[PDB]
Short mmCIF file of C-alpha atoms and ligand atoms in Angstrom, two decimals:
data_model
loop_
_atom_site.label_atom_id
_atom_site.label_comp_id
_atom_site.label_asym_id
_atom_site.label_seq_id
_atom_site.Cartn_x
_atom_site.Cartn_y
_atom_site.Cartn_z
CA UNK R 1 18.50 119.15 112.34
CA UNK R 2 20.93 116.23 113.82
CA UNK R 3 23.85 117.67 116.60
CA UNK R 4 27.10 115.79 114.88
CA UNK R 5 28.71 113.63 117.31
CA UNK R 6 30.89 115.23 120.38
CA UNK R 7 34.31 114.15 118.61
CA UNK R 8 32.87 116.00 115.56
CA UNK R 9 30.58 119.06 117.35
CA UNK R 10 32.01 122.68 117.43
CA UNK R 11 30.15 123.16 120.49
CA UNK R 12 31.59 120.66 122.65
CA UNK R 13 35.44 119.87 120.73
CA UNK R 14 37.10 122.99 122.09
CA UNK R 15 35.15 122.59 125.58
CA UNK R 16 38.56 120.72 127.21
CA UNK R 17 36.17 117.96 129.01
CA UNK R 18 37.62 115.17 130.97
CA UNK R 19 36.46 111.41 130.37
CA UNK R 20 33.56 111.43 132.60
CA UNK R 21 32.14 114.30 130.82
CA UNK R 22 32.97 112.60 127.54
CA UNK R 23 30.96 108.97 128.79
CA UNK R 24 28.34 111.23 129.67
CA UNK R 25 27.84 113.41 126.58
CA UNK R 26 28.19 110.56 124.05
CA UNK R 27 25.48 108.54 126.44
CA UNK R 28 22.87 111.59 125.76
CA UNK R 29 23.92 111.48 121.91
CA UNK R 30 23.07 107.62 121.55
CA UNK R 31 20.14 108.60 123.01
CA UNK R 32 19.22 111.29 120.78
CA UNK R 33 20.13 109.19 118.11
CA UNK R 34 17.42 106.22 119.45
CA UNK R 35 14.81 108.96 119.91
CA UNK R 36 15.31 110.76 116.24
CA UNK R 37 15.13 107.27 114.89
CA UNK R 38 11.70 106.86 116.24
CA UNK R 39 10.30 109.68 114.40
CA UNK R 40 8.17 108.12 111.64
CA UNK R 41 8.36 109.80 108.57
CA UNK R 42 5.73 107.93 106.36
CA UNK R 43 8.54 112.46 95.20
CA UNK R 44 5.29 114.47 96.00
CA UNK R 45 7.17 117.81 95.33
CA UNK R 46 9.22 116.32 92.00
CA UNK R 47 5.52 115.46 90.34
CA UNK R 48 4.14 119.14 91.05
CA UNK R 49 7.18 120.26 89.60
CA UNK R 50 7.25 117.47 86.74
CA UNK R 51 3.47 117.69 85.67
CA UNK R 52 4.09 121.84 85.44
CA UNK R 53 0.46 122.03 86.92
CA UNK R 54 0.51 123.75 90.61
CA UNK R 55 -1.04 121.34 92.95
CA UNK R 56 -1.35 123.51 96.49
CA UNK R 57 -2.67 121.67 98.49
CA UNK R 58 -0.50 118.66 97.61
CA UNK R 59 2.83 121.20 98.23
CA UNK R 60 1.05 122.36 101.75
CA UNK R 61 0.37 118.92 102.72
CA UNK R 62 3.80 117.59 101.95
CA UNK R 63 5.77 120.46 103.58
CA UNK R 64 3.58 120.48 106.39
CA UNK R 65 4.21 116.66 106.92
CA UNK R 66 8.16 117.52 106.41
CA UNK R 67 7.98 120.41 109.22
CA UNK R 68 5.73 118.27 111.42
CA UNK R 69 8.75 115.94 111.76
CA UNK R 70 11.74 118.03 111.26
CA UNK R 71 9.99 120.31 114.63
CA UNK R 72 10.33 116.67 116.71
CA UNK R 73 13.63 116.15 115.82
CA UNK R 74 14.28 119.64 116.99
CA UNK R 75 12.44 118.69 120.02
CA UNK R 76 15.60 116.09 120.95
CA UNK R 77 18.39 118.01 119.40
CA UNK R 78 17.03 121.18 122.19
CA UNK R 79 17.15 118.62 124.64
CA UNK R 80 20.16 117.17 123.97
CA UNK R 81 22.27 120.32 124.38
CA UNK R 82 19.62 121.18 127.63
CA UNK R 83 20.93 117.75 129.15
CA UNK R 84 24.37 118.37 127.99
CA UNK R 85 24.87 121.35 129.82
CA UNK R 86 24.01 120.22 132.98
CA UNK R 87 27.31 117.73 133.39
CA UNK R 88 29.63 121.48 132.71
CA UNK R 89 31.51 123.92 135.13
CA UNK R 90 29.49 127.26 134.54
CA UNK R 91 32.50 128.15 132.47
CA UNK R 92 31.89 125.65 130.06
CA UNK R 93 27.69 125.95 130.10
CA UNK R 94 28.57 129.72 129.27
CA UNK R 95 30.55 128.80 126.32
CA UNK R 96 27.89 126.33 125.05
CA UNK R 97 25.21 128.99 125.96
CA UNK R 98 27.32 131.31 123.65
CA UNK R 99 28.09 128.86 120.85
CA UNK R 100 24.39 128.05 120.79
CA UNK R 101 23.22 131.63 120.16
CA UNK R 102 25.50 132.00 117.73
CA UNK R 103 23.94 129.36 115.15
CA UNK R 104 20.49 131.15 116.39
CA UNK L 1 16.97 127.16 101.06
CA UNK L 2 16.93 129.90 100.45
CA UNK L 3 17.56 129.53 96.96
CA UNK L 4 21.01 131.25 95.59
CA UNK L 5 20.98 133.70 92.70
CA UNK L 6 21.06 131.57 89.37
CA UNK L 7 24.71 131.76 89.10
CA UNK L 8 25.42 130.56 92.20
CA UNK L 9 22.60 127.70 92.56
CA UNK L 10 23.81 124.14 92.30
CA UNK L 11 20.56 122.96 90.50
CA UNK L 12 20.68 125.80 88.09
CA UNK L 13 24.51 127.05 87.21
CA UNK L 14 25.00 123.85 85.03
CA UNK L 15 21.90 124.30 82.83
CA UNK L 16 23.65 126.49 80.62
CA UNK L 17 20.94 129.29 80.53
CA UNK L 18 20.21 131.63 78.15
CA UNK L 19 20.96 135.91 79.12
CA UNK L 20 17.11 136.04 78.57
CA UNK L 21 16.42 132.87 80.86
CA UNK L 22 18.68 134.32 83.54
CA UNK L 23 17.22 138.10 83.30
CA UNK L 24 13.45 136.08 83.91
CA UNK L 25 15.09 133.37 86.88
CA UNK L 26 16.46 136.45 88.65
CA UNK L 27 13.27 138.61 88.40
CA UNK L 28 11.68 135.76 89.78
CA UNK L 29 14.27 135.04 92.53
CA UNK L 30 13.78 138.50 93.39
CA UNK L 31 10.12 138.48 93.98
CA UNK L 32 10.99 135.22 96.18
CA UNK L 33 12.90 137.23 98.38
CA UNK L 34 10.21 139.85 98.56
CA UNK L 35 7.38 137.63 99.23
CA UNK L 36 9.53 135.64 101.77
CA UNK L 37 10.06 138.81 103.69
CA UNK L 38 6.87 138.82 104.69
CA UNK L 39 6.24 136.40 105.81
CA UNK L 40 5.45 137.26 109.63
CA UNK L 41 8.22 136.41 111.91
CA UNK L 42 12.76 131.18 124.22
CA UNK L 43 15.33 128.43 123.96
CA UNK L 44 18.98 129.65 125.06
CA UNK L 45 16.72 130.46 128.03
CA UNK L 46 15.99 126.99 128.79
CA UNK L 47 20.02 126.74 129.08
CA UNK L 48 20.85 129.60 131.16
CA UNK L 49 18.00 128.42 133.26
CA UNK L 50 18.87 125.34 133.58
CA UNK L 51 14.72 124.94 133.77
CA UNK L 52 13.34 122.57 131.12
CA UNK L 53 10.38 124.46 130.02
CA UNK L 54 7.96 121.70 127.76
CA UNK L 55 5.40 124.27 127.15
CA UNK L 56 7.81 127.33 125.79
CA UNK L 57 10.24 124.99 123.99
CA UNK L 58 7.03 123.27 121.43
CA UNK L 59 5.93 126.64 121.18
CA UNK L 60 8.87 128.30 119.97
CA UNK L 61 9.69 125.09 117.75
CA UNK L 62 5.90 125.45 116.31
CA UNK L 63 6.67 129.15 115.47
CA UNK L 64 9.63 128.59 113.51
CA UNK L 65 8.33 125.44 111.83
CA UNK L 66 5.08 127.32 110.80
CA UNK L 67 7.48 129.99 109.62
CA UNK L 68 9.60 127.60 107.42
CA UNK L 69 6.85 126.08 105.95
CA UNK L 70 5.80 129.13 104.67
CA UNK L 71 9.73 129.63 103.30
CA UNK L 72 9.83 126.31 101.58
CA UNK L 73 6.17 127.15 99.58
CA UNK L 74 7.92 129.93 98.04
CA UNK L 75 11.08 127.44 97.53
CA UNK L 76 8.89 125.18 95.77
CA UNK L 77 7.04 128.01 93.91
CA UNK L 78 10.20 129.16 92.96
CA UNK L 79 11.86 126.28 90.69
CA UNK L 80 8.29 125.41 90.06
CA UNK L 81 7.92 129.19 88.04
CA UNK L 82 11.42 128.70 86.93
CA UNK L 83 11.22 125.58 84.84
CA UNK L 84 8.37 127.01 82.92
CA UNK L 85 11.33 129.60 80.88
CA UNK L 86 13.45 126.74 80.65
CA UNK L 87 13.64 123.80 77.64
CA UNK L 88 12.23 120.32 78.07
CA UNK L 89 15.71 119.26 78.82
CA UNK L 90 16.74 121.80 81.21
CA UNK L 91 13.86 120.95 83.00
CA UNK L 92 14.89 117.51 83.12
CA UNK L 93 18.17 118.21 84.72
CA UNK L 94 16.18 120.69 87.82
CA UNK L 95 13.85 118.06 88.54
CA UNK L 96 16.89 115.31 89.19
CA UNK L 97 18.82 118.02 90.84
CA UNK L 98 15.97 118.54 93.41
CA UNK L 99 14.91 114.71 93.58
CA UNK L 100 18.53 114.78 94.92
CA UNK L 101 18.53 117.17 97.80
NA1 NA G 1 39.98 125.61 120.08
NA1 NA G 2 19.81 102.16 119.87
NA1 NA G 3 9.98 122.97 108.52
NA1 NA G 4 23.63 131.14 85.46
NA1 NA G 5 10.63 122.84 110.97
#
């Protein structure tokens, strides 16, 4: 779950923010960017699927290895639009506030 | 994810099924839906705030991920039950489709 850059985000494109809030923004998205990267994520599901024998706890382990790292990424993409908000006029943090709920 | 209806899901619209292998995907896409809706089921306030809460954030996050995990079983379950009504080389072209994603 990866925010897309600011030039290509919905949230933050129709936000009208100058260049300082711009250098800022795309600062904290490098930086999410460095962090996600850092998430290690050492055909499980294909084989279970291929061999038409159910293996459960193979499919458990697998998908609980897969939402293990997909909650850390979440972990910096929450952050990222918590860190965001604090360069905006109220205006704009209610807009991004609203946006946000929006995608749930 | 969750799966589309047979018709409209990329791994299985090109297969070419049968009217008998459709009426059996569907019951079975059905019963997905069922089984997914019970599965038993914070952060905007973090914004508003302005607040970082750690604590309420990674337990929201855990929620939902334990949640999803339970979702993508029955995902899994799902084409795994499908390809059993399907020919050896239908059940080729699934398994490459869902490599892919
Ligand atoms: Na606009
Ligand atoms: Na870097
Ligand atoms: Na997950
Ligand atoms: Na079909
Ligand atoms: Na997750």
């Amino acid at each position: 779950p990866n925010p897309p850059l600011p030039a290509q985000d919905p949230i933050v494109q129709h936000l009208k923010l100058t260049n300082d809030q711009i250098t800022r923004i795309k600062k904290l998205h490098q930086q999410l960017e460095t962090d996600v990267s850092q998430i290690s994520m050492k055909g499980a599901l294909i084989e279970v699927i291929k061999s038409g024998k159910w293996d459960d706890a193979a499919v458990k382990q697998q998908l609980a290895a897969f939402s293990n790292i997909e909650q850390q990424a979440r972990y910096y993409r929450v952050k990222y639009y918590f860190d965001l908000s604090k360069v905006l006029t109220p205006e704009q943090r209610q807009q991004v506030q609203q946006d946000l709920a929006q995608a749930l």
